[PDB]
């Protein structure tokens, strides 16, 4: 507190940490979704939800409490009978198309990362990226 708050030593991992740059020497960070245990758990939860959704009845109308103003005469069709059925179908199908969304997302991410050094200014303009792109084109 009173004295120098840094106290650099000859470790370079405490020295780098004390000045802010700690994770900046590792390739990729540490995350939670990278373990098979959490993956199995998430898959279990998703399968349970899909099971519950599929065990619903097909005839799943909804009484909307605003049908009062629509003077239904036992022959007309209520304009809101399919509102919980539509939501159930939407959730079920969205849960069944998860891998497709994952694939499209990873395609987008890869095709936007591969062009980082060409589309992002502060990466394209550093002397090191420019030097590397020049070094590749040496005839």
């Amino acid at each position: 507190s009173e004295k120098k708050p840094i106290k650099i030593s000859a470790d370079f991992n405490a020295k780098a940490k004390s000045l802010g740059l700690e994770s900046k020497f590792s390739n990729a960070t540490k995350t939670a979704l990278g373990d098979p245990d959490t993956e199995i758990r998430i898959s279990a939860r998703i399968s349970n939800r899909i099971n519950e959704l599929e065990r619903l009845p097909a005839n799943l109308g909804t009484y909307s409490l605003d049908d009062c103003l629509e003077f239904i005469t036992k022959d007309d069709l209520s304009s809101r009978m399919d509102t919980f059925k539509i939501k159930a179908l939407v959730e079920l199908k969205s849960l069944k198309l998860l891998t497709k969304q994952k694939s499209i997302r990873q395609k987008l991410i890869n095709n936007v990362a591969s062009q980082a050094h060409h589309n992002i200014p502060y990466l394209r303009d550093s002397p090191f990226t420019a030097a590397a792109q020049r070094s590749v084109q040496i005839r």
Partner: peptide
Amino acid sequence: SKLMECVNDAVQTLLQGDDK
């Protein structure tokens, strides 16, 4: 990494003055 923000602000204030 919060100390370096104060350090940068101090250096900028140094650049503001003349007889410093």
